[PDB]
Amino acid sequence: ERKYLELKSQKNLYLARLKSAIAAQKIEEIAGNLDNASASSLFERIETK
Amino acid sequence: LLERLLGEMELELIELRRALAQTIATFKSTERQRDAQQLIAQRWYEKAQ
Ligand SMILES: Nc1ncnc2c1ncn2[C@@H]1O[C@H](COP(=O)(O)OP(=O)(O)O)[C@@H](O)[C@H]1O
């Protein structure tokens, strides 16, 4: 029982880190960097249009 | 044939007109891209001053 708690007290902490990084990856790919000039950034794709 | 042939000819010409525009886009796009790099080099040169 004492060993049981030490696991649960950390599980929530790991999930938070996982949700933080996974979201960060999602945001960055949509960065739409203006410098790409290759349509990889959706903004520069608009500029070409 | 004469009526049919010209109809094909007119259809082709606009396709040429559309394609040539895309060439201009890259010609302008790279030129804008070119100016960006030298600006960065200027920053280092200005910083080196
Ligand atoms: N200092 C920089 N930081 C980020 N991106 C840059 C920098 N200098 C140039 N770039 C851009 O990064 C892009 C990488 O090319 P590309 O493979 O088309 O994009 P992606 O990395 O999205 O596949 C280039 O098109 C270029 O315009």
From TrEMBL, chain A:
Binding site for ADP 2: 33, 35, 38, 40
Residues reported to bind ADP 4: 35-36, 38, 40
Coiled coil: 1-49
Binding positions for ADP 5 per the UniProt entry: 33, 36, 38
Binding-site residues for ADP 1, renumbered to this chain: 8, 35-36
Positions annotated to bind ADP 6: 35-36, 38
Sites where the protein binds ADP 3: 35-36, 40
Protein family membership: Belongs to the PspA/Vipp/IM30 family.
Protein name: Chloroplast membrane-associated 30 kD protein
